[PDB]
Design a binder for this molecule. Structure first.
Ligand SMILES: Nc1nc2c(ncn2[C@@H]2O[C@H](COP(=O)(O)OP(=O)(O)O)[C@@H](O)[C@H]2O)c(=O)[nH]1
Length: 168
């Protein structure tokens, strides 16, 4: 029988939070200039034979000054933290967000996924794979690079966070 899990997707503006989520949920790459507002999707996924009902919370992009909420610091089963490999600023910001997140969750190990998105834009990449891998390692977080244009990598992101959560 199925299990329910709630995942929050966090990160700086225009890193691809919406696009990655929509690619996973709907199978389509959408290019939109609407600002990302908090949006919750529901999605079925099977991971190692276990069926999951996912609630995916896309959050508005935040920056270093962003006060971290409290609503995103309880009842979440796992967090996907997204930066863009084409944006140094998004990478600086994801460190600040992670720090504020750990401060809010208290004395518990919470599944965290670091995601470097937009890996298809080879001519604009300014962050190496190794920089993100090393960051995730210092965090004990899973790490993947992704492209919202590539369905397999979006699926792999959301499978991975469920893999991490099930380890407890
Ligand atoms: N080439 C490419 N463009 C992307 C990718 N992800 C997002 N984008 C584009 O980047 C812009 C911001 O993406 P969006 O999903 O709205 O970012 P959000 O603010 O984090 O939700 C939009 O133009 C997207 O079409 C990606 O993986 N590859």
């Amino acid at each position: 029988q199925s299990k329910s899990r709630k995942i929050a997707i966090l990160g700086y503006r225009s890193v691809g939070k919406s696009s990655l989520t929509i690619q996973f949920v709907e199978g389509q790459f959408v290019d939109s200039n609407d600002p990302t507002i908090e949006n919750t999707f529901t999605k079925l996924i099977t991971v190692n034979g276990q069926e999951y009902h996912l609630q995916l919370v896309d959050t508005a992009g935040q920056d270093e000054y962003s006060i971290f909420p409290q609503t995103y610091s309880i009842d979440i089963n796992g967090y996907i933290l997204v930066y863009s490999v084409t944006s140094i600023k998004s990478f600086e910001v994801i460190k600040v967000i992670h720090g504020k997140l750990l401060d809010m969750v208290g004395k518990v190990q919470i599944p965290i996924m670091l995601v470097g998105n937009k890996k298809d834009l080879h001519m604009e990449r300014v962050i190496s794979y190794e920089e993100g891998k090393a960051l995730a390692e210092s965090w004990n977080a899973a790490f993947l690079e992704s492209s919202a244009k590539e369905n397999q990598t979006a699926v792999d992101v959301f499978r991975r966070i469920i893999l991490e959560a099930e380890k407890l």
